[PDB]
Structure formats: structure tokens, C-alpha cells
Design a protein around this ligand. Structure first.
Ligand SMILES: Nc1ncnc2c1ncn2[C@@H]1O[C@H](COP(=O)(O)OP(=O)(O)CP(=O)(O)O)[C@@H](O)[C@H]1O
Ligand SMILES: Nc1ncnc2c1ncn2[C@@H]1O[C@H](COP(=O)(O)OP(=O)(O)CP(=O)(O)O)[C@@H](O)[C@H]1O
Ligand SMILES: CC(C)(CO)[C@@H](O)C(=O)NCCC(=O)O
Ligand SMILES: CC(C)(CO)[C@@H](O)C(=O)NCCC(=O)O
Ligand code: NA
Ligand code: NA
Ligand code: NA
Ligand code: NA
Lengths: 307, 307
């Protein structure tokens, strides 16, 4: 029975690296790695390099589709210094390492021969501010689709891919756990734009940012492993993020291992796990490429959409 | 404010015809026109010709995307006699003329220089048989998403676009209003496949046929106009389709105008209108091109997705 997908073990995927250069050192990789992630240079060569290759191939191909529609339209033939921004979506659960995935990806692509402008934007800045969330009774639903200003987000991406000189996104503060008044992230006609979020692959009764993605990535892992990574991260943050007196969750720092685990599980069970099962996972079927992470965090299986 | 869409009046769209040949006569056009449709050769030149042009441009462009993924994969470079079938989805409400639209489209594309194999398949054959619908209490829901064997339909399209030598679809009988035992429609690696249906543009928690569309068409019109066209068609069929003694609805033939109108409105209000409003219309935002039909049935406005 035919399928729109084709599986790959790390062995078969790495082969597709061909002669792709590794323009990243250990120090740099470290500056991209997130707390808990085990990503090393080897994984960057066997997994992220074939990926950067596939993407640069598609960035060329996909360039025709916009050219053809330009020809048909009798429009002047597209300006070289301003191509149509290639949009890459990176989705997945909280604590699955998708942000490291996104950061690494940004680093690699930025280091491609002609050095393309490659921006990275997370959906955090599109979260409604706490005051607005309380108003909507969503202070315990940060992460769910309804906790974001989806129109604003769609506006942003639409603006960047339609060729605007600049588009701005609000900025979120994890330290203060809320939108930062007046903060803007400015994106200026990048060549590649990576949008990272939880449900960015969602589809619906209106055109959404997923309909604008030229390529999508979904960082996947067994649910029980993700919970472990989540709890583990929570405990570790008692001495990093929560240690800061300025942290909204500074009082989590004095928790004991037991208390920490209990609190992390509650948060996971009441927010993150439901959001993963009801909203995030249902979108995995449409991802161009799925990166499967084993319990040890390593990518040992990939799924690609050939259709 | 930027947009993923660009509007067109008949005047601006026809200009895009360029030097496209009209390989269709009146007799032929007639043999494609449905009861109630006002389509003439002029509309075929001003609306369907620019469309056939745009499509053949995209069929070339879109060919790269599959080539690039073939290159990346180190796969042998695609066989010329067997390209990747281009999939066109045609959606819209019952009685909006989308089938005529599909038939005309098939005729034009089949008449393109190198004469490509262009098949047309409606989703009717994927409807569950009456016995199965009764079992599910859906005998008054033919047309709704749940009245079709969506897995089968997805299997069919997946098979055709994955390059199978042949794929078969069940056949529906409008005369007998049910699936025809043993009837199969065989599709053999066509170059272009047009899938026509009511909710074929729907998206969901699994990869669906809309995710495989390389181009989609949505035939639109004001809801009140569609109801008129629907009722009008119902009355006219008292002397065509319902006139046949073998017709499942043969007893509608003896209805008076008044009785006919009452019955048609009930059917429209209880089945077709709800299905249009809850399921069909919500999918319009993703259509590549929307053909707007005025009350007189003429296409005087078009909406194209540039993003
Ligand atoms: N609770 C938090 N505190 C501080 N920074 C956070 C954060 N959650 C996310 N971030 C930012 O996003 C990055 C995510 O890195 P990583 O890929 O290792 O985890 P993740 O994004 O898969 C799970 P998360 O939903 O917690 O971000 C963090 O390194 C930091 O840059
Ligand atoms: N009730 C019916 N009786 C006979 N044929 C029908 C039919 N409904 C659909 N068909 C077939 O599909 C064609 C549809 O033609 P047209 O484009 O004019 O209407 P339509 O498809 O937009 C509304 P419908 O949902 O009734 O098919 C009919 O001409 C016939 O070939
Ligand atoms: C689980 C950690 C430490 C890491 O993901 C972090 O996401 C966290 O605890 N944040 C505050 C509670 C929450 O995750 O909603
Ligand atoms: C309205 C007509 C005549 C034409 O669409 C036809 O669709 C019809 O009446 N069919 C049987 C009832 C129904 O439309 O469900
Ligand atoms: Na920038
Ligand atoms: Na496809
Ligand atoms: Na055929
Ligand atoms: Na697009």
C-alpha cells in the first residue's frame, strides 16, 4: 500500500549528507544547546546537515512556483535582491528540544555560501499578556491555541512572506512570564524565516500560518519521555532560571526534589500534556519532516513527506 | 495591510489569456454543460483559458519540487513517460455548477499541445452505500463528510499521486441513488487528475486529499442564489431525470410546481444548506482560485492565492 511518507533510520539519513560542510564549532553549538539537550557535533553532521541540504534544494525549486505565478500574471519578473521569504515551521511539545532544533537550524542555514538573512521567531511574543489571559480565564492555558493572538501572528507572517521591508512581533519574557511592554522584534525581509511554536502547524476555518509554510519540522518523542525531560528540566531550573530573585517562579527554587517533581507533574498533567494530546500531536501528520527523538534525546528515526 | 489573496474582475483576468488557443466548439461545450448552467464560449475564453494557462505554468514549476526531493534522496532522476500526477481539487456547494466547471477544465487541459491524460473523478463513488448509511443513521446526510469512506478516498488519491499504474474508485448511480455493485472507475497514471467533490478541501487530524492537491478550485456564489439554482434544477428534473421510471425519485415527477418547490426547499434546508455552511464554506479560504458566480451564473470575479 502506497504512502505519502518515507521512513529513515539515522544510517540512511546521514548518507544524504553528500559533501555538505559543517560550519559550526563546539563552543557555538554549546551556545545554542538548551538545558537537557544532548546534541553533539556528530548529530549535527548526520541529521542536521542532510536537512540543510534538502532545504536549500527546496528553496531553489519552490522559487519557481512564485516565478510561474509572476509570469502568468504578466508581472515584472521578480527582483533578485528580494526573493520570496522561505518559511519554515518548527513544531512540537514543550520540553522536546524543538527550540534547540530551531536554533541549530538557523545557525547552519545562516552559514550557507551566500550567507542568507535567516531570522528565528518563536510564537511566545504572540501570547496574550497575562492581564488579557486572566480576563479570558486562560491563565492556566498558556500554550493552548486560544492563548495566542492568532490574527496578529498570521498578520506578521503574511507581511514577511508578502515581501514587506519590515514586520514586528511582540516580545515575551520567560523571566517575568509575560509580554514585555513596548518590546518589538523587527524582521527585515529575511531570505529564510523560521517560525517556532507549539501549534503553528494547526489548520482551520481560515488561512493560518501553517498554510504559508514552505517546509515544516515536527520534533517528536514518546510522551512518557517528554514528561521525564519536562520534570527533569523543572528540577534543574531551581538553580538556573528560578534561582534569579527577579524570576516569577523564584519560589520554586526552594522546593525539594519531591516537591519539585509533584509540582512539575501537576503542571504537565493539567496544561502541557493535554495541549500536546489534543492540539499539538494531531498536527504531526502534515509535517514535511518529523525528527524522532529516543529516550536519550538522540534522533534515530526520521519521517519525510514525499507527497 | 498585505494579503495572501489578489482579486480580479472579469476584465483583468481575461487579459491573462495571452495567446491561449480555444480548442473547444459549441457542440462539445454543450455536451459538458449541466442543466441550468449558462456557460458559453465567451466565458470559456475569458475565464477558463487564463486558468488553463496558469495551471500549465504551475504543472511545470511544481515538477521541480518533486525533482529536488529526488535529487536530495540520491534517487535516480525521474522517468519522463511517468511524471508525478498533478492533482487539482474542485470544491463547492451542490448546484453551484462546479461539475460543469470540472468537466470544462478537463476538456481544455486534455487539449494541450502534447495531449496529457487528464482524468476526472467525483467523490460520489466514495459515498457509503445506502445500506451502510442507514446502518449509521446517515441516509439524510449524504454529502456530509461522514457519509463518505474517506480512508478509501485518501487511499485512491495517494495511490495515483504516488505513481501507481492503476487505481480504482467505486461508482455511484444518481439514477438509483446508490453505489453500483461491482462498478469500478479505473485511473491509469494520468498526467493530471481532477478530483471533484463537496468537502475535498477539508483538512483534519490526518493527512487528507486536500494535502495532496497541487491546485484547488472553489466554485462560489451567494447562498440565496445557490438555493434558487437548486430549487430551479429540482423543478426542471421532473421532466428529465425524475421522468425516467427507473429513477429512485421518479415520484417527484408528478409534483406540481408548488409541491416541487416545497420539497426542494426542505431538502435544501435540512441537508445541502447546513452542509454548505458548516462544512463546505469553511474550506474556501484555502482554495488556490475561487470562481465567483453572479446570480445569472456568470463568473465576474476571481480570487487567487499568491501565498
Ligand atoms: N522556562 C523557560 N525559561 C527560560 N527560557 C526558556 C524557558 N522555556 C523556553 N525557554 C527558551 O526557549 C529555549 C528552548 O530550548 P529547548 O529546545 O532545549 O527546549 P524546548 O523549546 O524544546 C521546550 P520549552 O517549551 O520549555 O521551550 C530555552 O533554552 C530558552 O532559550
Ligand atoms: N441529481 C442528479 N441527477 C443526475 N445527474 C447528476 C445529479 N447531480 C449531479 N449529477 C451529475 O453531475 C453533474 C453536475 O453538473 P453541474 O455542474 O451543472 O451541477 P453541480 O455538480 O454544480 C450540482 P450537483 O451537486 O447537483 O451535482 C450533472 O450534470 C450530472 O452529470
Ligand atoms: C519544565 C521546565 C523547567 C522546562 O521546560 C519549564 O518549562 C518550566 O517549568 N516552566 C514553568 C512551568 C511550565 O513549564 O509551565
Ligand atoms: C436540485 C437538483 C434537481 C439539482 O441539484 C438535484 O440535486 C436533486 O433534486 N436531487 C435529489 C434531491 C437532492 O438534491 O438531494
Ligand atoms: Na532581520
Ligand atoms: Na504535495
Ligand atoms: Na485513465
Ligand atoms: Na505558499
Amino acid at each position: 500500500e502506497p504512502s505519502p511518507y518515507v521512513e529513515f533510520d539515522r544510517r540512511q539519513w546521514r548518507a544524504l549528507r553528500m559533501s555538505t560542510p559543517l560550519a559550526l564549532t563546539e563552543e557555538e553549538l554549546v551556545g545554542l544547546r538548551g538545558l537537557g539537550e544532548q546534541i553533539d557535533l556528530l548529530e549535527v553532521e548526520e541529521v542536521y546537515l542532510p536537512l540543510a541540504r534538502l532545504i536549500h534544494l527546496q528553496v531553489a525549486a519552490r522559487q519557481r512556483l512564485f516565478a510561474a505565478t509572476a509570469e502568468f500574471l504578466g508581472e515584472p519578473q521578480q527582483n533578485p535582491d528580494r526573493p520570496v521569504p522561505f518559511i519554515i515551521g518548527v513544531a512540537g511539545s514543550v520540553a522536546v528540544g524543538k527550540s534547540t532544533t530551531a536554533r541549530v537550524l538557523q545557525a547552519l542555514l545562516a552559514r550557507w555560501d551566500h550567507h542568507p538573512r535567516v531570522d528565528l521567531v518563536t510564537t511566545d511574543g504572540f501570547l496574550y499578556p497575562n492581564a488579557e489571559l486572566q480576563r479570558r480565564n486562560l491563565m492556566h492555558r498558556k500554550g493552548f491555541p486560544e492563548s495566542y493572538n492568532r490574527r496578529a501572528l498570521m498578520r506578521f507572517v503574511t507581511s514577511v512572506k508578502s515581501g514587506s521591508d519590515y514586520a514586528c512581533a511582540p516580545v515575551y519574557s520567560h523571566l517575568h512570564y509575560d509580554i514585555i511592554p513596548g518590546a518589538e522584534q523587527v524582521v527585515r525581509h529575511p531570505d529564510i524565516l523560521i517560525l517556532e511554536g507549539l501549534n503553528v502547524l494547526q489548520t482551520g476555518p481560515t488561512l493560518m500560518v501553517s498554510d504559508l509554510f514552505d517546509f515544516s519540522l515536527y520534533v517528536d518523542a514518546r510522551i512518557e519521555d517528554i514528561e521525564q525531560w519536562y520534570v527533569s528540566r523543572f528540577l534543574a531550573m531551581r538553580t538556573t532560571a528560578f534561582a534569579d530573585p527577579e524570576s516569577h517562579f523564584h519560589h520554586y527554587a526552594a522546593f525539594s526534589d519531591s516537591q519539585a517533581v509533584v509540582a512539575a507533574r501537576e503542571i504537565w498533567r493539567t496544561i502541557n500534556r493535554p495541549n500536546l494530546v489534543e492540539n499539538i500531536l494531531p498536527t504531526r501528520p502534515r509535517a514535511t519532516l518529523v525528527l524522532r527523538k529516543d529516550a536519550d534525546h538522540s534522533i534515530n528515526r526520521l519521517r519525510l513527506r514525499k507527497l
